Amino acid sequence: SQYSIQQSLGNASGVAVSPINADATLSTGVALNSSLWAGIGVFARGKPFTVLAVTESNYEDVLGEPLKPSSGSQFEPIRHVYEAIQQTSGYVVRAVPDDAKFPIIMFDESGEPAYSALPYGSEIELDSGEAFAIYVDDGDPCISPTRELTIETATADSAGNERFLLKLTQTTSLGVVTTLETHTVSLAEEAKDDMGRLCYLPTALEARSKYLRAVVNEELISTAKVTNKKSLAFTGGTNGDQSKISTAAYLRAVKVLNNAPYMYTAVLGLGCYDNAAITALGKICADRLIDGFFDVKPTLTYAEALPAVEDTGLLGTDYVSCSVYHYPFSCKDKWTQSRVVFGLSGVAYAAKARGVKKNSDVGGWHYSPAGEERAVIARASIQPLYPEDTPDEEAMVKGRLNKVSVGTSGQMIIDDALTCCTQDNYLHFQHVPSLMNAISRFFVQLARQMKHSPDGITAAGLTKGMTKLLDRFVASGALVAPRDPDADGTEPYVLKVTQAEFDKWEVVWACCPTGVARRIQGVPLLI
Amino acid sequence: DYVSCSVYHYPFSCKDKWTQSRVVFGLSGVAYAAKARGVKKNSDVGGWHYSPAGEERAVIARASIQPLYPEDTPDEEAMVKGRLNKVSVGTSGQMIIDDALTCCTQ
Amino acid sequence: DYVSCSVYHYPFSCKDKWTQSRVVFGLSGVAYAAKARGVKKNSDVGGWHYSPAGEERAVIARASIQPLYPEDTPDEEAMVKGRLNKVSVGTSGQMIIDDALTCCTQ
Numbered sequence: 027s028q029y030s031i032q033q034s035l036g037n038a039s040g041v042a043v044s045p046i047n048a049d050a051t052l053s054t055g056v057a058l059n060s061s062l063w064a065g066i067g068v069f070a071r072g073k074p075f076t077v078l079a080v081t082e083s084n085y086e087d088v089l090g091e092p093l094k095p096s097s098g099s100q101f102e103p104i105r106h107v108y109e110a111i112q113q114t115s116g117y118v119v120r121a122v123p124d125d126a127k128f129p130i131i132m133f134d135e136s137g138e139p140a141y142s143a144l145p146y147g148s149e150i151e152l153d154s155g156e157a158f159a160i161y162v163d164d165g166d167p168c169i170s171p172t173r174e175l176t177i178e179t180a181t182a183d184s185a186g187n188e189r190f191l192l193k194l195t196q197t198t199s200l201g202v203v204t205t206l207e208t209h210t211v212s213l214a215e216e217a218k219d220d221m222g223r224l225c226y227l228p229t230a231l232e233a234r235s236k237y238l239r240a241v242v243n244e245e246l247i248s249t250a251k252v253t254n255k256k257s258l259a260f261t262g263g264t265n266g267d268q269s270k271i272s273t274a275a276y277l278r279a280v281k282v283l284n285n286a287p288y289m290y291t292a293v294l295g296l297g298c299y300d301n302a303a304i305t306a307l308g309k310i311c312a313d314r315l316i317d318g319f320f321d322v323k324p325t326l327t328y329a330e331a332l333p334a335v336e337d338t339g340l341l342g343t344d345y346v347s348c349s350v351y352h353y354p355f356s357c358k359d360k361w362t363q364s365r366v367v368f369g370l371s372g373v374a375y376a377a378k379a380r381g382v383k384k385n386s387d388v389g390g391w392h393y394s395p396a397g398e399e400r401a402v403i404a405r406a407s408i409q410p411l412y413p414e415d416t417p418d419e420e421a422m423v424k425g426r427l428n429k430v431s432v433g434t435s436g437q438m439i440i441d442d443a444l445t446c447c448t449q450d451n452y453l454h455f456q457h458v459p460s461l462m463n464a465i466s467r468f469f470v471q472l473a474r475q476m477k478h479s480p481d482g483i484t485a486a487g488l489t490k491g492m493t494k495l496l497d498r499f500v501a502s503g504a505l506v507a508p509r510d511p512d513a514d515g516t517e518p519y520v521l522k523v524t525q526a527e528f529d530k531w532e533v534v535w536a537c538c539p540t541g542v543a544r545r546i547q548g549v550p551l552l553i
Numbered sequence: 554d555y556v557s558c559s560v561y562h563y564p565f566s567c568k569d570k571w572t573q574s575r576v577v578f579g580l581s582g583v584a585y586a587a588k589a590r591g592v593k594k595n596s597d598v599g600g601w602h603y604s605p606a607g608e609e610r611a612v613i614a615r616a617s618i619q620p621l622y623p624e625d626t627p628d629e630e631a632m633v634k635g636r637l638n639k640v641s642v643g644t645s646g647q648m649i650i651d652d653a654l655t656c657c658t659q
Numbered sequence: 660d661y662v663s664c665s666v667y668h669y670p671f672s673c674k675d676k677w678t679q680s681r682v683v684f685g686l687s688g689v690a691y692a693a694k695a696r697g698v699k700k701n702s703d704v705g706g707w708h709y710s711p712a713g714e715e716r717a718v719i720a721r722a723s724i725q726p727l728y729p730e731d732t733p734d735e736e737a738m739v740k741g742r743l744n745k746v747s748v749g750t751s752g753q754m755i756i757d758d759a760l761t762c763c764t765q
Contacts, residue, residue, distance in 0.1 A: 027748045027755075028733075038735035038745070039758050220765055229574060281624050287642065474644050478607035478653075 034205055045202065055082030055112075061379050062290040063116035066279050066298060066307070067103030068268055069093075071166040074122040074146055075279060077286045080107070081115040089118075090166065095359060095366045098269030102297035102368045105359075109372030110294060113379040117290060119283050120165070121275040122146060125266020129168060130161035131175065135246060137253045143262030152243040157250040158213070158227065163239040167263040172197045173206075173237075175258040180210060187217040189225055190252050194237065207235060213247055276303040284310055292378065295320040297369045305339045308348050315463040317378065317456070318348035321369040325354065328417045332425045341426065346447040347459045349374065351428050354412060355438070357405035367411060370403070373440065377401035378456075385502055388468075391460040392504040392540055394443045398433045401440035408438060442544075458539045461504050465537070468495055473531075488533060489523045496521065496537065508538045558656045559584065559605075561638050565648070568616035577621070580613070580640070584650065587611035606638070606653035613640075613648040662763040665690065667744050671754075674722035683727060686719070689756065693717035710759045714749050717756035724754060 032042040071090030072078055080088055085107065095101040107118065127143040134140075134156045144150065150159060160175070162168070178191040194206040212225035219225050223233075227240045280303060293311050298304060304320055311318035322334045331352045335341065340348050353370040377400040381393030395401060422429060423444070431441035443456040452458050472491045476484055496519045499505055505518040519537040526532050561580040569576040587610045591603030605611055632639055636656050643649035669686040693716040697709030711717060738745060739760070747757035 027746050029748065036736060037739045040735075040747075224572065224574070232575075233573065285624050285626070287620075471644055475608060477651075478604055478610075480602060 034203075044204075051086070053083060053086055057081045057083075058114050058383075061114050061292065061382050062288070063110055063114065063292045063294050063375055064283055064286065064290040065103075065107070065110075065116065065118050065294040065296040066121065066276065066283060066303065067107070067118060067296040068100050068122075068271065069104060069118075069120055070265070071164065072118075072120045073163065073165040074120045074126075075282055077117050077119055077282065077288065079115070079288075080111065080118055082111050085111055092361050093268075095362060095364060098267075100268045101366065105366075105368050106294065106296045106372045108360075110375050113376045117283075117286065117288055118296075119279045119286075121271060121279040122165075123266040123268055123271050123275070125264070126167075127262060127264055128162055128165065129260035129263035130159055131258060131260065132156050132159045133252075135249070136251050137177070137255065139255070139258055141261050143264070150241050152241065155246075156243055157246050158240060158242045160231075160238055160240050162237060162260060162263065164237045167265050168260045169263070170199065173260055175255070177252060177255045177258075179252070179254060183212070183218060183220075183225075185216070185218070187212055187214040187225075188252075189217065192238075195257075207237065209235065213250055213252070273300060273302050276300055277306060280306040280310070284313075291316050292375055293318045294375055295369070295371045297321065297371075299323050301338055308340050308345045311348055312345055315466055316347070317460060317463075318345070319351070319371040319374040319378075320348060321351050321353075321371045324352065324367050324369060325411070326352070327354070327412055328415055331427065332421060335425050335427065340446045341448060343447060343449055346445055346453050347456075347463065348446045349428065349444070349456065350426060350446060351440075353430065354410070355408050356411050357408050360406075370440075373401060373403055377440065388498055388502050389464060390502055390504070391464045392457045392502075394455065394457050394542055396428070396440040396443040396456075398439050402433065403430075403438040403440070405438075443542075452539060455542060457542065461499075461537075461539055465495070465499065465535075469533075484531060485523055485525065488531070489521065492521055492523075492533065492535065496535070499537075504540060505537050506540050514538075556655055556657050559638060559653065560636065560656065561640075561650075563640060564621045565640075566619050566621055570616075573616070580650070583613055584611070587650065604653045606650050608643045608645075608649050608651075611650040612643070613650070615648075618648055662761055664762045665744065665760070666742060666762060667756075669719075669746065670727045671721075671724050672727050673724050676722075686756070689717055689719050693756065712744070712756040712759040714755055718749065719746070719754040719756070721754075 032040060033044055035042050069089045070093055072088055078088055089104065089107070092104045093100045110116065124145070127145050130142050130144060130150065132140045132142060132152070140156075144161075146165070150161065152159060162173070174195050174197065176193045176195070178193070180189045180191050182188055189210055189212045192209045192211055194208075196204045196206050198204075209230060210219055210225060211227045211230045213227065215226055217225040224230065228242055231238050231240045276298060293307050293316065295304065295307065298307075299322070307320065308318060320338070320340070322331060322338070326334060335350055338350065340350065351370045351374065354367070356365050356367050358364070359366045374395055377397070378395040380400045381395060382389050382391060384390045384393060393400070417429070419429065426444050426446050426448070428440060428442040428444060431439050433439040444454050445456055445459065447453045469492065472495070473488070476487050496505075500518055507516055507518055508514040519535060521533075521535050523531070523533045561584060563578075563580045566575055566577045568574070584605050587605035587607070588603075590610045591605065592599050592601060594600050594603060603610065627639065629639065633652075633654070636654050636658070638650065638652050638654055641649055641651040667686040667690065670683070672681050672683050674680070675682045690711050693713070694711040696716045697711060698705050698707060700706045700709060709716070733745070735745065742760050742762050742764070744756060744758040744760060747755045749755045
């Protein structure tokens with residue numbers, strides 16, 4: 027028969043191979059989902075102002091190719107996402123400037139296309155004499171990889187309504203053509219596909235398409251026609267100057283992240299370096315009782331780093347679970363092999379996730395997010411950005427900054443874990459608020475399960491569930507016997523449940539945390 | 554005058570059952586289902602003391618819920634003062650009727 | 660009306676088993692043999708879910724096969740739209756039925 031091999035599939039059955047691609051990458055991995063992170067940033071592709079689920083395998087496809095460090099400062103958030111994604115998955119929200127626009131194709135009666143572009147915020151208004159429009163909802167400018175539409179008529183359905191085929195293809199710079207999607211759609215409301223679904227263009231595109239969306243004009247679709255067209259290309263879709271983004275966009279994206287229906291257990295700065303956005307993210311962390319890992323500008327010198335911490339506004343007593351880092355150093359970029367400088371929040375989150383993975387029953391949140399075995403920084407070649415400069419350790423401790431050191435393998439190590447609490451209590455350390463927040467979240471879930479119930483049931487259930495949960499936490503090693511046996515007994519925890527009013531409950535508990543080994547001293551002697 | 558009357562508000566959207574067309578409609582017959590489930594617990598006299606709200610008795614079984622007005626937050630205390638019932642996401646993940654109030658200002 | 664029927668087309672020449680001459684004939688028996696081989700796999704109910712085409716089931720064993728009309732090229736999409744089944748080559752150098760489509764245009 028035939029020994030030929032095709033490049034694209036089509037409808038015939040066979041095996042096809044594409045031409046060899048010189049410049050492309052393959053990423054593989056698995057989703058662990060034990061902990062999730064949330065962030066805010068600027069990227070190259072993705073629907074703006076909408077929560078996106080990102081995992082290790084599909085991060086390149088959802089977020090697009092990395093941005094060049096030589097152009098502005100948009101390259102940092104993608105590096106942070108890559109660092110933080112090697113442990114678990116998470117969610118991001120995209121912020122876009124005002125100059126950005128998306129392409130749109132407007133048809134009319136007899137099918138005469140017209141091309142235009144609109145800003146993201148604005149809605150589409152159809153002028154008199156136009157039937158329908160199709161626009162790209164992916165939030166991806168079609169500059170370097172072009173996208174085209176072809177329209178082919180098909181057989182009428184059982185009821186006699188007209189139908190046609192819509193096909194989407196993508197072409198690269200060298201001219202390689204790839205097939206993306208195919209659809210069978212109609213211009214009549216009560217039109218049904220062969221498989222039994224509806225063929226109305228807006229409904230079909232919304233239900234079963236990932237890139238395209240449609241808007242229809244109800245005045246003229248009573249008498250509208252379509253003809254065979256080939257390779258209609260989108261034009262005008264641009265990304266604005268992304269090095270200049272106002273604080274309004276950051277605040278809007280933070281508000282979007284606040285009301286996300288999903289659940290996450292950490293918030294990452296992802297290199298915003300904006301005070302309003304940082305304090306809004308801190309408010310989110312305080313609201314949901316989760317951890318926070320934020321960063322200050324790495325290009326600052328040692329002396330200027332301390333005032334910026336107070337400039338962030340997190341210092342005080344309201345935000346006791348947040349942390350601030352500072353990492354002035356230069357490393358070789360993975361993608362461009364050039365010298366770049368970026369932040370350190372992703373490494374901290376990865377260390378926290380590694381600590382969490384140790385215990386499978388309740389989580390084991392008592393492990394500090396710093397250390398030689400957990401918090402490791404992997405960069406090609408690291409040099410100080412400001413040589414002939416010396417840090418002051420005590421000033422950093424008093425101002426709540428975390429230091430770095432060198433491990434036994436010659437790689438940089440995060441060497442401290444301090445939160446933004448100035449009260450000098452047991453609440454400096456990262457693990458103590460983590461324990462308390464985990465216990466509180468478990469209690470909230472338990473109470474929510476047995477809500478709206480008649481009398482005589484809630485008290486016993488509450489006390490039994492709380493005792494079992496605290497026993498599990500004692501077994502996991504988080505709680506230990508108190509250090510002062512004169513003032514307190516030997517019991518690691520106490521509990522009490524009382525009923526207050528007709529429809530009110532109140533429960534109080536106390537527990538003793540576990541210490542950490544931070545500073546060790548040795549003394550040599552000679553005989 | 555009108556005690557034992559409840560008013561609900563459901564601004565979410567869901568896929569329809571007969572034809573998957575993303576329709577919107579209110580919560581009447583979902584509350585009554587919760588009340589009927591509460592009544593079925595007792596067989597002698599009925600047991601009318603069970604409130605329709607709750608994470609177990611009142612569940613909304615619809616295909617895919619998408620808020621109509623995201624990034625917006627209601628005022629819960631004003632709703633309580635205004636005798637309007639609220640809907641919230643439960644622990645399992647499905648939407649739940651979380652409160653049950655009648656129309657009596659006193 | 661006829662959704663279970665199939666149509667084949669096999670323009671090729673081969674040596675006859677009996678007269679050793681060059682003859683041209685059809686392809687229905689091979690398809691039935693592939694279907695029977697598929698049915699034999701499951702002994703309880705029959706296992707009718709196996710398609711009657713493939714590299715291991717449907718093999719066309721003939722002495723020496725040459726195209727009847729060389730210098731000619733088929734059109735695959737036209738055959739798919741018109742409900743015709745195609746042929747290919749197995750790893751042993753023998754021809755293989757490479758498709759299974761019925762006479763339904765729906």
